[PDB]
Structures are given as structure tokens and as C-alpha cells.
Design a binder for these strands. Structure first.
Lengths: 141, 136, 94, 38
RNA sequence: AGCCAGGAUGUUGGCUUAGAAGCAGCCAUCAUUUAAAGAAAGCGUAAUAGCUCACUGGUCGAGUCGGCCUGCGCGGAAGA
């Protein structure tokens, strides 16, 4: 996008609409609308699948509030959707907490090409397995 | 605090602290904190300096205290006249001469050995220096 | 591979040696083999920077004294107690 | 400021200056790092 | 040493995430298009964000950087 003009990235799991406890006026401090997380954002969320937060660029113009297009599903809850226990990582790498099969990461990495850094499949394969190094997720070779 | 487990006589004469030292090379470890000044070191100063080192290079490494007190220093109480016996054993010192490797350290990089030996040489009364393990 | 230029000590004892170390030198001796031992004075700084290497104590040295060459090996070094300098070096012939 | 007898650079912006025969530590980042008399 | 440029993605990495989305948290601490880049070295947040730097290019046209051994000095150093 452009120079930093009132766009930030914030929400929690977007299976529901308009999270009032976690953030609230964090999406109301800048020119970002309160209403455009509730109906139209879920209208643009149902196009693929629900149950994922979206770190997104919301460029607030001199229009009504802004215009928004969601682009990429992030790898946090994509690497938590089938990893192990539902609590979290804590100290995940010094023991064996999680494990991930690498074929689904090859196909999701083969899908995601917008918000990445890489031009080869193998070049960006073990980057998401670097996110498996993050949450201690042991890859199954 | 260090102190011999069992002496042979409780009170020692003063005597003097002349000449150079015997423990001079870094023997056990790889880096050494070697004395330059003469002085003498109580058991509290050895303990204070060892805690500064052990804290400083955390529970990694291995530290050798190459000096040991084994010399009892007696003091007379306050408002007691002169005479009427020798005093009482208050603490224990080691006598240091120029050349004693007071401490050794191994299993760290040199820059942490510099750091712990700076941190711990400020708990001792003698001017001190850093030495390495020289090969012959 | 080290070449250490030396002279012969015409004087010895503690007076002459301590006079010789204030003049930024130090005494040394070359003994071993069948020859007589050879009292040698050495420049200090050259030998100190030279012995900072490890190969000084392992490789065969060459000492040039009176325009000769004696291939020696550094047997045993007396160092100063609390200063980075040398008192004396025993060199065994090789 | 801090009159100490060991003056040191506490930060990377701290800077030792001798003014009028007095060692000083002039910082730009934090004015708590201003020191005198080393 | 100045001066002109670039310095990211998974990375909301999960957090006890009540707000940490590199910033009161711990484990990790990887991999890439790239000269170069830290799941952030300093600040900083209601909170992302905001900058600078660590590194690289251009301008620059001769020394510069930090240790060691030393001589002489400075501070530390207030009394009737």
C-alpha cells in the first residue's frame, strides 16, 4: 500500500462479528469504521471459510469510511488448526509439543503467493516450517 | 566462608609477607585472575568475589579458587587494655604476594572471563590483573 | 622458521642480569648435545611478540649468534611473576 | 546531575568532555546520564 | 568520521495474548527473493503503527581504529 495513513492490523478469531472485549476502540481510534467489521466484513469473509483472524491493510480515505479487500489467510491459526493441544505453545521447542505434516504446508504455500517473500516452492517451503520452528511444531518428513 | 576444618594450633604469629608467589601459571583452568599487589585476603572477600564471578558467568563454566585462608587473625575487643594474653580468632586470611593466581575459570569465552574478573576484582583489596593459560 | 639474533654474555650473575633486563633484553642459555652450554643475551620485544605464537614452543628455532646458526628448541621459560615479560629461556639444541 | 568519582558512559549517546579541568559526561538521549568530577 | 539512499515476508508466531498485533511474556531465534536486514539493538505506545540503527550502494580522497608496556600530570581531596 502507500505511506502509513491510518492503517493498522488488529482483530481476533472472526467466526463472530465485531469483537467487543479484545480490541474494541483499537479499531475505532483511527478512521477505521466500527460497523465495517460486522456485516460487510463477514460478507467478504464467507467467500472462502470462517474462523480466522485477518491482519489487514485498512486505508482510510476521504470516502465514507474506507474500502477493504481481504487478501491472505494468516499462518498463526492456520498452523494451530491441526497442531496438537488447543492451549498454546508456552515452551514448545525444548520438548515435542506439536507436529505438522508438510504436504498441506506445500499446498498452502503453493496457494499463498501475495504476502510472502520468495519465488520458488522450496524457497518458501521451510519458511512456514520456520513458523513451525516458532511454535515448536515438529515437521513430519 | 572458607576456613580449615581442623587446625593444629588456634593462634598463629603475625609474621611477614615478603617475596613473590608460587602459584603463578593458570594451571587448572583457561583464564586467571592473578594478583599484582601484596595484601592479604579474608575469607569474606574470597566469598564475595566468588559470588560475583558465579553470578556473572552464570551457572555455566567452572571456577577454581586457587587460594585458601588458613591463617587465623586475632583481635582484642573494644575497651580492653594491652596485655593479658593474645586476642581472639576473629577471621582467617590468606597471605597474597605478587604473582598469585587468585582464581581460575574455564568453559566460557574470554570476554565473559574479562567481565566476571572485573566484577570480582572490585571486591578484593589488592591490585589484580587478568592472565591466560600460557603453554610453557 | 624463527630467527632470533643473539649475543654472547660476557657477564653473568644477578647484578649483570638485572642490568641486562633494564636495558630491554634478557638472558638465556643454549645447552644440550655434547658442546658446552652457551650463555646468550636476547632482545626482549622480538622474543615476546614471537612467543605469543604457539609454534615458538613446538617448532625448531634458529638462533644466530656471532654469525653462526644454532638450531635449538625452546625448553623452558622463566617468566616475570606479575608482568607480561620474560626472565630467562632455556633452549635445548636440536 | 550526578557528582561521582567514577564517571562513565552509561549509554551509547553519552560523551566524555573535559571542561575546565573537570571530566564530564554529556548525554543527549537521557539527561539523567549527565555526570561530573571523574 | 560526515552527507545522500534501502533496511522486509510467514511475523496477529502462540502467549496469562484482559490491550503486546517486533514493544510489562516465555520458548524459540528460522528460511527467501536480496549488495542487506534483528520473528527487532535503542526509544515509544489503550494498540498495531511511528523512526533511528545493526548491514549495503553512491559522494568523499589519506590515514584511521582499539588494545598493551611506560614517564610526567588531572579528578577523587571537607575543620574549626
Amino acid at each position: 500500500a502507500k505511506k502509513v495513513q491510518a492503517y493498522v492490523k488488529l482483530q481476533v478469531a472472526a467466526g463472530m462479528a465485531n469483537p467487543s472485549p479484545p480490541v474494541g476502540p483499537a479499531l475505532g481510534q483511527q478512521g477505521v469504521n466500527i460497523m465495517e467489521f460486522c456485516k460487510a466484513f463477514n460478507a467478504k469473509t464467507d467467500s472462502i471459510e470462517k474462523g480466522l483472524p485477518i491482519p489487514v491493510v485498512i486505508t482510510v480515505y476521504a470516502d465514507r469510511s474506507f474500502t477493504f479487500v481481504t487478501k491472505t489467510p494468516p499462518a498463526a491459526v492456520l498452523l494451530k488448526k491441526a497442531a496438537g493441544i488447543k492451549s498454546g505453545s508456552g515452551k514448545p521447542n525444548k520438548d515435542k509439543v506439536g507436529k505438522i505434516s508438510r504436504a498441506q504446508l506445500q499446498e498452502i504455500a503453493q496457494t499463498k503467493a501475495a504476502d510472502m517473500t520468495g519465488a520458488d516452492i522450496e524457497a518458501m517451503t521451510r519458511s512456514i516450517e520456520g513458523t513451525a520452528r516458532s511454535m515448536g511444531l515438529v515437521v513430519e518428513d | 566462608m572458607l576456613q580449615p576444618k581442623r587446625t593444629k594450633f588456634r593462634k598463629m604469629h603475625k609474621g611477614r609477607n615478603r617475596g613473590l608467589a608460587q602459584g603463578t601459571d593458570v594451571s587448572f583452568g583457561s583464564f586467571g585472575l592473578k594478583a599484582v599487589g601484596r595484601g592479604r585476603l579474608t575469607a569474606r572477600q574470597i566469598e564475595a568475589a566468588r559470588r560475583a564471578m558465579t553470578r556473572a558467568v552464570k551457572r555455566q563454566g567452572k571456577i577454581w579458587i586457587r587460594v585458601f585462608p588458613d591463617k587465623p587473625i586475632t583481635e582484642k575487643p573494644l575497651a580492653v587494655r594491652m596485655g593479658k594474653g593474645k586476642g581472639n580468632v576473629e577471621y582467617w586470611v590468606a597471605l597474597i604476594q605478587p604473582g598469585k593466581v587468585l582464581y581460575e575459570m574455564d568453559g566460557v569465552p574470554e570476554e565473559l572471563a574479562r567481565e566476571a574478573f572485573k566484577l570480582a576484582a572490585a571486591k578484593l583489596p589488592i591490585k589484580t590483573t587478568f592472565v591466560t593459560k600460557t603453554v610453557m | 622458521m624463527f630467527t632470533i639474533n643473539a649475543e654472547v654474555r660476557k657477564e653473568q650473575g644477578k647484578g649483570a642480569s638485572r642490568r641486562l633486563r633494564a636495558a630491554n633484553k634478557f638472558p638465556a642459555i643454549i645447552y644440550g648435545g655434547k658442546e658446552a652450554p652457551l650463555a646468550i643475551e636476547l632482545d626482549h620485544d622480538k622474543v615476546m611478540n614471537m612467543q605469543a605464537k604457539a609454534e615458538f614452543y613446538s617448532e625448531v628455532l634458529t638462533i644466530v649468534v656471532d654469525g653462526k646458526e644454532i638450531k635449538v628448541k625452546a625448553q623452558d621459560v622463566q617468566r616475570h611473576p606479575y608482568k607480561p615479560k620474560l626472565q630467562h629461556i632455556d633452549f635445548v639444541r636440536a | 546531575m550526578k557528582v561521582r568519582a567514577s564517571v562513565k558512559k552509561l549509554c551509547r549517546n553519552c560523551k566524555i568532555v573535559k571542561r575546565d579541568g573537570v571530566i564530564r559526561v554529556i548525554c543527549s538521549a537521557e539527561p539523567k546520564h549527565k555526570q561530573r568530577q571523574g
